[PDB]
């Protein structure tokens, strides 16, 4: 009955630790009072939460920090680069030729090609969610990464280099006021004045969702598109079929 | 002008961490909610400071656990033993038979002596020194060691083994409060009930003062005793004297 309270003894240990070993991708600032020192953590977690949404929209698979990696490389012009080919259009691209190449003296001639072209038009459909995933949500905060964050780390890191110059002017007894006013402005900027992320993310809820709607309610349309074989097909004279 | 930052830069923790290195002879007890793990602290802070004042009074060089272990190792009998030869037994034990070696038709044959039983009798006012010191200031306070202070490492012992026992018997859902009421009861006895040790420094500060009041005014009949030679000895026919 040793063993049992041993193997839970050193196991609460690593339950307790199990948080801070990963999720990590830039520096740390350098450790101020804590009206200054909590702006700035809170720059840091403002930061990597800046720098961490990015990542999503484009795999379908980010639990890890490669997708921060393809995040931190960025690109701002799309010239001489097509839209990615999506599950849609290579699901009715085989189908226009099979129902081409199939037969027409059958019922299925007047129903793949309704399905060929449903799959067509729901393949333009996530040719635009590409776009509205890519340009109203990866390019702005691209555009801000690489435009006033650089001034803030710029800033931060003039105030944390002559800190320390200021530091040696006033321990020997017997650049950092306008430094630190400029960023600590601007770490006020970044935590106050924070109404620039609420209208991203309630954007990017509905640039993803109003794509569901409309090929939801297109392929709604396949069913009416498709009913003439529960009433004129049905009534044929070689076979029933489902009502 | 970094190296002299630098130098008290890393200086500043070696400072700040210069207390906890050190003064440890006994261990330390289980870590309890704060009311019950602040009177188990405040229990070892009593148990080391009534196991660290009988070190003080026999050696005249404590300021090291080795004096602590001089304490450790305790002697309830005087049986066999005497007392310890003290400075002013040894400073007139010569001086007897230097004044009976030297010569006595001399002024000093008047003199020596007077200084030899002072002496010889402020020996045995150093000899009540060290039983006034040993008596009322080491004995209680050891069999208060040997005493009571074993019941309360017992019944906080078998409070920090029944606790665990007690977690084993609430954890797995679907001796600790008698144990923990006694233990709880010696704590606040040690804390609340603290009217032994006032009376022990306020008669040891008693025992050491009532010793030098009676050197000093046995110290001030040598110059009674000694004075003829700045009257009778003064009006010399072979010297003058000072006066």
Redesign the interface.
């Known amino acids: 009955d040793f063993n049992v309270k041993k193997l839970a003894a050193d196991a609460g240990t690593f339950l307790s630790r199990a948080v801070q070993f990963t999720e990590e991708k830039l520096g740390q600032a350098e450790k101020l009072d804590a009206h200054l020192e909590n702006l700035l953590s809170k720059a840091e977690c403002t930061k990597i939460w800046t720098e961490k949404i990015m990542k999503q929209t484009e795999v379908l698979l980010q639990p890890n920090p490669n997708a921060r990696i393809e995040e931190f490389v960025y690109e701002k012009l799309d010239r001489k680069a097509p839209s990615r080919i999506n599950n849609p259009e290579l699901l009715g691209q085989y189908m226009i030729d099979a129902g081409t190449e199939f037969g027409p003296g059958t019922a299925y001639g007047n129903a793949l090609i309704k399905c060929g072209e449903t799959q067509k038009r729901i393949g333009t459909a996530d040719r635009e969610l590409i776009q509205t995933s890519a340009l109203n949500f990866l390019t702005p905060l691209r555009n801000f990464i690489e435009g006033d964050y650089k001034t803030i780390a710029k800033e931060r890191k003039l105030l944390q280099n002559k800190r320390?110059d200021l530091?040696?002017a006033k321990?020997?007894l017997k650049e950092f006021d306008r430094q630190a006013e400029i960023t600590r402005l601007l770490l006020e900027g970044i935590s106050s004045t924070h109404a620039h992320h609420l209208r991203c993310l309630n954007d990017f809820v509905e640039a993803q969702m109003t794509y569901y709607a409309q090929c939801y309610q297109y392929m709604l349309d396949l069913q009416k598109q498709l009913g003439s074989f529960p009433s004129n097909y049905l009534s044929n004279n070689n076979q029933t079929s489902v009502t």
């Open positions: 320390l530091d040696a321990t020997r």
